[PDB]
């Protein structure tokens, strides 16, 4: 059947996702991030 022949060939087309710009998202940190080498702390003297 021609209709079945068209369907079999063009049936499997994965969808497409459209996410706009300016959207809010998260990042869920998957590992321990160590900032010891790049920052250090010091106290600001009073007044």
């Amino acid at each position: 059947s021609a209709a079945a022949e068209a369907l079999r060939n063009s049936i499997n087309i994965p969808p497409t996702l459209y996410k706009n710009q300016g959207e809010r998202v998260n990042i869920l940190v998957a590992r321990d991030l160590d900032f010891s080498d790049v920052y250090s702390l010091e106290s600001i003297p009073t007044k």
Binding site: Y18, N20, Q21, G22
Partner: peptide
């Protein structure tokens, strides 16, 4: 038939200045 939505377009009615006061980064 169906097309991707556009992001919100802001209304063009309540147009006001951004700068109520001169910034300090201009040093004024």
């Amino acid at each position: 038939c169906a097309s991707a939505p556009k992001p919100k377009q802001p209304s063009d009615f309540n147009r006001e200045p951004v700068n109520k006061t001169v910034p300090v980064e201009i040093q004024r």
